[PDB]
Amino acid sequence: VVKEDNIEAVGKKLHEYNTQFQEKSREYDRLYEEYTRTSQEIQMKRTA
Amino acid sequence: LMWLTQKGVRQKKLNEWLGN
Amino acid sequence: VVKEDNIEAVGKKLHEYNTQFQEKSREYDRLYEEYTRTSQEIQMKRTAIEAFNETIKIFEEQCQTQERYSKEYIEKFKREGNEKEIQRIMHNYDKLKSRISEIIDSRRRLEEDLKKQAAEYREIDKRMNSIKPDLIQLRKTRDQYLMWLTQKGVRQKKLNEWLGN
Amino acid sequence: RQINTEYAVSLLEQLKLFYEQQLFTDIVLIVEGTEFPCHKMVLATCSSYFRAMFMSGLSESKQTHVHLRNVDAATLQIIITYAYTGNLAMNDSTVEQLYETACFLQVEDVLQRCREYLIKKINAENCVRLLSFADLFSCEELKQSAKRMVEHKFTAVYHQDAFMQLSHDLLIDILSSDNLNVEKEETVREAAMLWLEYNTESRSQYLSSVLSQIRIDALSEVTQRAWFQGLPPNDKSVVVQGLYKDMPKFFKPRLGMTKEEMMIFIEASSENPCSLYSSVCYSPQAEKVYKLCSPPADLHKVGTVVTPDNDIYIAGGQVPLKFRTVNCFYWFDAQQNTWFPKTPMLFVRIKPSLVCCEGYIYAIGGDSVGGELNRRTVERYDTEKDEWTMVSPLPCAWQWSAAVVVHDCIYVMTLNLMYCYFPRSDSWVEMAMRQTSRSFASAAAFGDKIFYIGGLSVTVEIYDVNKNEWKMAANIPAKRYSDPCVRAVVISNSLCVFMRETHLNERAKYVTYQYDLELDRWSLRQHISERVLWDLGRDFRCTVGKLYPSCLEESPWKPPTYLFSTD
């Protein structure tokens, strides 16, 4: 736990890591949605 | 995860830190 | 997939290949276990034969120590007209020579054991060398069928049930 | 046919009543002046001797007075009491004379009962005497049992007076056996010397036969000391289980030169989930997997007791509910490597913690909760009497309390109430304890300062006994917090542990640790690989005792390499 394995401290760190991970999965699937919309965009623009 | 849960972090408590 | 499209028939093939693949993995890890046991077998034997070698060396050291005794303290045990006192090195010499002979025979027994186990290990080691190209070829064909045949209406649970048989 | 037994017992009790009042007494046996009136039919249908003496049709079947010589009066009375009842009252004081009288009279039932009683009563004080008795009376089973017992503890019984009075055949069959439990051939040489010098005028002609049986040119384990110890880590044990096997049996290293520190895993687990209460012995020197038979009759919740002579024992026990609480006692041998049934106890010990306090195993608690007069009952293990005398019982219920003797005085630290467990005064003088009231404190023979690492919380508390002080080392290295699976072991009298703190899967992470006392630091000794050592539990019995790898079932049954990268 970043050199702080002390029950309450070890667990509070775990919560900070939980935040970091959650923010990423949200931005990860957001970037995936952006990838998909850009893909269909260039497909519609190439058919145009 | 093989250290915090091994200490005693209950899965229910993990879900609370995974939900905020 | 032999240009087939009955889907159900193509799936039956899928299972037939599944069997062949499973049989191989079992014989594959069996050959691996055989490799490991043969490795520890020749390890236990290379140590036993070097122990035999060092024992023969120290027995030859005792043999020349007998010649050393033939000049160290033999002067007071041969010119007195007695034979029971000299048995501590004279009756300990002939049986030592017989021990040398029988441990040489035992070393020959260990050597023939080594060559027979090496033969019975190489007769299947060549099978490993020939079954692995066929194994990876069958696995490549299975992976190629996993791109088209699997996407023709079969479920992963169905594949697992076909993996069981 | 269902032969009537209800009529059989009434007729037997009526015959006894008639014999007590001396009715229909047709024969009179005269033994050293004492007279005994009896019936010829009972003596015939019980002893084959009297049957042949009466069915011969001579004057012995016609004369009422028969003089029997070389027969003790008490033994004849006991035989008649068996002839008229069938129950035998045997004791360790008059069992040999009773067996002699029975073999002279050929009573198959009494002979078999005395034989099995002598077999189940062979100790380390009468082994030589019982062997001489069996040789004189030609009892093959008792002879073999006594010979095995002598081979197990030769270095402890070759000083007895019964050993110097043995015959020539006994000496040449004991010395020629490769099962002599001796660490050096000098012991056997001195034994032969004292035997031949005990009576020189009658054994001066047997000096050649004496010297022909002692291995002089063997040089079993001295040749390895000559060249070098250069090998893979402690691979001298591999040479033990190699050179010995292939040997013309004249220069064979005796069984005592094969005894090596072994990890007796009692009630251990295996890779197979069904065999979670099996047993797998291990060598901390040759790094090899052996098989064990810890459960005799599927007896679980037992207590391993290795004596200084390396004789593993068991206490209490639990047979699967037909768990059916049983008390059948069992002793793990080393030569035959088998469990020997004996007298059961009066209290079923549930996984007891016992040690050979002052060379005497005591039943230190190791029970359950429900009465101090029933559970938590320290007892005594009579060795020659083979009895279980009760002694001052443990006051409160103390479970998972490692029993460790210190300076010939049991120092069992409990949850938070350590006492001065006395093996002589039998008292509970409250000794210096801790403040952490927890059990699961693994501790082995750690000498003056014991270490009860464990609490299910792995504080390595220092247990100074001589200075009666109380210090502390540190904790077992882990991560945020490891699982306390401490298994304190004592390999070759050392301060080690078998911590199985499961971290990255791999069953349990079996890592042995090196404990410092002069430096009072923290290090690691060895790291038992999981490639062979699979699931073994977290708190199972793991005693350390010198054992023969040749007699240990050499069965690994555990494939090392796995997870091929072929995929």
Question: What does this entry look like structurally?
Answer:
The structure is cut from a larger assembly and holds three copies of chain A and one copy of chain D (567 residues). Chain A is mainly alpha-helical and 48 residues long. Chain A has one helix spanning 8-47. Chain A is rod-shaped and about 60 Å long. With 567 residues, chain D is α+β, with helices and mostly antiparallel strands. Chain D has helices at 6-20, 40-44, 48-54, 73-84, 95-105, 108-119, 127-137, 140-152, 154-157, 161-164, 168-175, 185-198, 200-203, 207-211, 223-227, 236-243, and strands at residues 27-31, 34-38, 65-67, 260-266, 313-314, 318-319, 324-325, 329-332, 339-342, 356-357, 360-361, 450-451, 461-463, 470-472, 488-489, 496-500, 510-515, 522-524, 541-547. In chain D, the strands form seven sheets. Chain D has a four-stranded antiparallel β-sheet, with no helix packed on it. A three-stranded mixed β-sheet of chain D has the order 2-1-3. In chain D, strands 5-8-9 form a three-stranded antiparallel β-sheet, with no helix packed on it. In chain D, a hairpin with a 2-residue loop joins strand 10 and strand 11 (360-361). In chain D, helix 4 (73-84) crosses helix 5 (95-105), helix 5 (95-105) packs antiparallel against helix 6 and helix 7 runs antiparallel to helix 8 (140-152). The longest helix of chain D is centred in the N-terminal third of the chain and has 15 residues, at 6-20. Chain D is globular and about 95 Å long. Chain D starts with 5 loop residues before the first helix and ends in a 20-residue tail after the last strand. Chains in contact: A-B, A-D, B-D, C-D. Chains C and D meet through helix 1 and helix 2 of C and helix 15 and helix 16 of D. Chain C: It comes from Homo sapiens. Chain C: Belongs to the PI3K p85 subunit family. Chain C: This is Phosphatidylinositol 3-kinase regulatory subunit alpha.
Strand-and-helix sequence of chain A, N→C?
H
Biggest protein-protein contact in the assembly: C-D, 26 and 22 residues
- Radius of gyration of chain D (Å): 29 Å
Question: Count the strands of chain A?
Answer: 0
Helix content of chain D: 10-25%
State the end-to-end CA separation of chain D: 69 Å
How many helices of chain A? The count is 1
The count of helical stretches of chain D stands at 16
Report the β-strand fraction of chain A as a percent range.
under 5%
Proportion of beta-strand residues of chain D: 5-15%
Shape of chain A: rod-shaped
> Biggest β-sheet of chain D: count, sense, barrel?
4 strands, antiparallel
Protein name (chain C): Phosphatidylinositol 3-kinase regulatory subunit alpha
Modified residues (Phosphotyrosine) (chain C): 32, 145
Family (chain C): Belongs to the PI3K p85 subunit family.
Domain BTB (chain D): 25-92
